[PDB]
Amino acid sequence: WELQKENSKRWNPEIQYTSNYNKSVNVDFTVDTNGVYSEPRPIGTRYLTRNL
Amino acid sequence: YFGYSTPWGYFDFNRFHCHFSPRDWQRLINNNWGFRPKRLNFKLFNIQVKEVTQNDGTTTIANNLTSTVQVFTDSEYQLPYVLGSAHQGCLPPFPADVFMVPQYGYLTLNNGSQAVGRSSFYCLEYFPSQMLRTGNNFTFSYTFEDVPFHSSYAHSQS
Amino acid sequence: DGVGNSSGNWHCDSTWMGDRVITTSTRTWALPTYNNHLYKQISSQSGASNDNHYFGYSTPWGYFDFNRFHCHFSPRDWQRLINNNWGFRPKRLNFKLFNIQVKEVTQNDGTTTIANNLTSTVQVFTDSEYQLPYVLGSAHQGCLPPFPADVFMVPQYGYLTLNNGSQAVGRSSFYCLEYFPSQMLRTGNNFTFSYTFEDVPFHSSYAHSQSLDRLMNPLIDQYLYYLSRTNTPSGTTTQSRLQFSQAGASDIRDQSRNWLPGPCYRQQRVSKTSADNNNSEYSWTGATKYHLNGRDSLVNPGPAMASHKDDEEKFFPQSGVLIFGKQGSEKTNVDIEKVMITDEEEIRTTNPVATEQYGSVSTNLQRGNLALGETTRPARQAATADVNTQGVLPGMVWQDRDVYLQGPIWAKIPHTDGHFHPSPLMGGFGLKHPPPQILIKNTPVPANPSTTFSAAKFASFITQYSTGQVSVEIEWELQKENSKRWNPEIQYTSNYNKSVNVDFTVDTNGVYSEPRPIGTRYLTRNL
Amino acid sequence: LDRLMNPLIDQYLYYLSRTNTPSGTTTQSRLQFSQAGASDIRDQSRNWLPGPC
Amino acid sequence: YRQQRVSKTSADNNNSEYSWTGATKYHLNGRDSLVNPGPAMASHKDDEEKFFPQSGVLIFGKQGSEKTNVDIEKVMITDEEEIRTTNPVATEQYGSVSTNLQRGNLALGETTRPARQAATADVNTQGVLPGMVWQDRDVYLQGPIWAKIPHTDGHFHP
Amino acid sequence: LTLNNGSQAVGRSSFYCLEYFPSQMLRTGNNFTFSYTFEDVPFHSSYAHSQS
Amino acid sequence: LALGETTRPARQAATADVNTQGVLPGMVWQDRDVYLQGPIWAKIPHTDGHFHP
Amino acid sequence: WELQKENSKRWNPEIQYTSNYNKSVNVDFTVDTNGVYSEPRPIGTRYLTRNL
């Protein structure tokens, strides 16, 4: 895959994709106690911001 | 809307009368099927900074010889692009006029009058810029990309 | 060189080359004349408490302080560093002064005139031999501002020396800063120097995905035994028969381990909810502190250790964390809502919790009732005591304090016969030869001497100050994150919901603010 | 070590200066923070500790 | 870091459960963890071989030893005594340290006239101090060859 | 084992899939080898002191 | 302040003098002086570990 | 300035120029609280001793 790197002068921070830090019975994107792997949510793409 | 006003000014030549004159325009318009721009050169020079002092009902203006003016051009297109919105503050049509330099500001995402997390803030002192003191000048050159000729003709058929 | 030529340009910018990163920043400064050109003795006042006495000297000189991270990184640049990397250290720096212009100010009646003084000089030196008291790294204010469009005043230089009470001692030193070769700059002159950081450990920008207490395989028992049970039921009344077990996954606390947590010096626990806390003044009597020469000194950062355990986030060590002010916070006695309290919890994996003991230690020697014609017949019993302070012990592992973008970059290790793990307790990189101090002064310009000779000192000078721009360029080395972790990491994110103001931005009045402390450790490593 | 720093400049760190506050006749607990100057010297934040004992 | 002393003769030991409440332990994140090996230190002094630290030695099983609650006769208790030369004995304190400041009775018009006296206290835990020498735990052919130092900002004598 | 709060996972807790590593597949008649060099480490002390 | 709790007694902040301190990270110290009629040197024992010999 | 170094077989110690170690309100050869620099005493020269 070829990547296009992000070059921006934006000052304030970007929005990023983050997994929640709170405690949970199961970890996201992981097998459960029965061995079944699951994907909790659709993960999109657009996060970093460009000016139009 | 939501946005930020900046201390910076900017130069706008984006109107044709900044370049052509009513006669020059006429040579273009009558004699040609079309045209496009190719290169440009830009220069700042004979820069002089004045300090202004107001005591009571009088105002004095004097040279400040050591003050600087700082200028940059963004060639990487990293700031919101204000030109091409048909704003005013172009170089005047008539060469003997003197013009004020417009203030730079930009808009970003809004929800109502409130900002959104994706909305951007740009600091223009975060760009390398050239500082000019009286006796210093600024230049750069630019090459237009290939673009279709404008059509200066009308059709004799439908 | 000249009156009408610029001495340098504005370089503020950041380049990420994938191994290194260079952060350049330029600011505008203003430099008064401090102490009306003359040195002064300073000391604590009269009946000040013994803990607060001091003796020293204030100087006419100013100094430049870039020692805070936000002088270099920007909230976005910081985010690229923090999310993508295991660590980092500084490499070289460049420093420049330029576009220097000196202004004379005249006050007649109710008006003030300011004019150029073209022939005046500003004089600047950096001490590369570390021959002056080193003020940087004390977390003083007067850094280059976070936001590049701000203008800052240059701080005044002063230092402390030995004291007995408010009085000097024979070993106390006096330093004259005009006794150093210094460079004099007139408008059209500029100053530069470069500096190379010594080899220093990368800061750890990661948190551990494991803790010492669970380091091992749940599925397999050990082959070591521990003492599981002591007495045994015999008839009605039990008797003592000691028995051993082999520690499994339900025994986890009992398993044998190769390592121990980092050391501790306790803190008192206060809660962010004002109703939970006791009603009294414990702010001093309850504080944790040391003393030299018979005078107590509070320990604010202390040794690095976690600020609270699971689901206690309400709490935090009394003195034991860094606390930052919100924009426009007053100096003294300001509310909990006006400060930003840093949170060290990511280190709970290794370091102890600051408000709880290192552990418990045995005290007496147990015995049994059984004896023959002995005064030793009383059986006593096993006793234990909480160890509230633990010095470093063989086989201990720990983590240093985090960095915190508005916190300190470095500090100078004192010059001493011995050190242990010279990492500054405020955080940052301990350096034997830090970036040198850059000292700056307005050269005096006497005003109208008398026509007949007088051997007395000049008390009358032209009132004046100077200004100009300062540029700092630091090169940072990065340690890239290589991990097989499957699930996603935690990242630093700005909220996507609507808000009146954007975080890390100027408001409608033009005031730039930093909403929260931004830490470092996000990406996770296994221990 | 205990005096290592600049007397003339305050720090930018805060410490917990005062715990309770007068309320009516009988005080209540409201914790307040101060920023350590030259009269606070014992309260300032420091990077180092004395040797062992 | 002290251990409790238990004797291999079951009649000498107290009748109770001290196996946990009496154990030496640390805690991270608010949960106690027994320290089995502990820092390396001798298991007993001269002619005490009957005794040994509660958790403080490696214990190996004899061939065919059951997992849980197995007798003293089914285990093999290692003996660290060869280190008594340098390291402290695990069941006894590092030493004693002064506490108060002594003075005399003699004073003139003073409330300080009571003479007090010299006091001292056993130091049950000692962190590393300048000028200390020690010996590491022995190897023990059925014991471990190596371990991984955690990846951390600092270590001491890994 | 990984981070826990009680018996529950925490957001920083990690999941490792071991099929996500290049691994060598061996069929009867295939063998596996590798070599390793220990880093410099102090000699163990196999001696006792004749002095205290 | 508590509601239906046996934890209502407020206790108070307590502290204790530390009479022995082992080396802790971030400590600096000075060695004993020499004293012209005192010792020049000594032999470090041969041992698995030392600290600041 | 050219220096002439001191070569002597004297056994006992020389007299030296020393600043007093006792506490004092002001340090010798230093500015005071008003910024005035003062020299407390004449400092001579002859200290080291030669045989005649």
UniProtKB/Swiss-Prot annotation, chain B:
| Compartments, record wording | Virion; Host nucleus, Host nucleolus
Which positions, given as ranges, span the membrane? none
Lineage top rank: taxon: Viruses
Applications in industry or biotech? Answer: AAV capsids serve as viral gene transfer vectors that have been shown to affect long-term gene expression and disease correction with low toxicity in animal models, and are well tolerated in human clinical trials.
Question: Domain notes, please?
Answer: The N-terminus of VP1 is sequestered within the mature capsid. It contains a phospholipase A2-like region and putative nuclear localization signals.
Question: What remark does the entry add?
Answer: The ratio at which VP1, VP2 and VP3 proteins are synthesized in vivo is about 1:1:10, which is the same as in the mature virus particle.
* Function of the molecule: Capsid protein self-assembles to form an icosahedral capsid with a T=1 symmetry, about 22 nm in diameter, and consisting of 60 copies of three size variants of the capsid protein VP1, VP2 and VP3 which differ in their N-terminus. The capsid encapsulates the genomic ssDNA. Binds to host cell heparan sulfate and uses host ITGA5-ITGB1 as coreceptor on the cell surface to provide virion attachment to target cell. This attachment induces virion internalization predominantly through clathrin-dependent endocytosis.
Q: Which family does it belong to?
A: Belongs to the parvoviridae capsid protein family.
Q: What is this protein called?
A: Capsid protein VP1
What gene does the UniProt entry assign to this protein?
Answer: VP1
Curated annotation (Swiss-Prot), chain C:
Keyword Calcium applies = no
Q: Which UniProt keywords apply?
A: Capsid protein, Clathrin-mediated endocytosis of virus by host, Host nucleus, Host-virus interaction, T=1 icosahedral capsid protein, Viral attachment to host cell, Viral penetration into host cytoplasm, Viral penetration via permeabilization of host membrane, Virion, Virus endocytosis by host, Virus entry into host cell
> How is this protein used?
AAV capsids serve as viral gene transfer vectors that have been shown to affect long-term gene expression and disease correction with low toxicity in animal models, and are well tolerated in human clinical trials.
Molecular function terms, GO-annotated: structural molecule activity
An example Gene Ontology biological process: symbiont entry into host cell via permeabilization of host membrane
Q: Does the keyword Cell membrane apply?
A: no
Q: What are the boundaries of the signal sequence?
A: none
| Cellular compartment(s) | Virion; Host nucleus, Host nucleolus
Sorted alphabetically, the Gene Ontology cellular component annotations on this record are: host cell nucleolus; T=1 icosahedral viral capsid
- What other remark does the UniProt record contain for this protein? The ratio at which VP1, VP2 and VP3 proteins are synthesized in vivo is about 1:1:10, which is the same as in the mature virus particle.
Record's function text: Capsid protein self-assembles to form an icosahedral capsid with a T=1 symmetry, about 22 nm in diameter, and consisting of 60 copies of three size variants of the capsid protein VP1, VP2 and VP3 which differ in their N-terminus. The capsid encapsulates the genomic ssDNA. Binds to host cell heparan sulfate and uses host ITGA5-ITGB1 as coreceptor on the cell surface to provide virion attachment to target cell. This attachment induces virion internalization predominantly through clathrin-dependent endocytosis.
Domain-level remarks: The N-terminus of VP1 is sequestered within the mature capsid. It contains a phospholipase A2-like region and putative nuclear localization signals.
Similarity comment: Belongs to the parvoviridae capsid protein family.
UniProt-recorded name of the protein? Capsid protein VP1
Interval of the full protein contained in this chain: 219 to 735 of 735
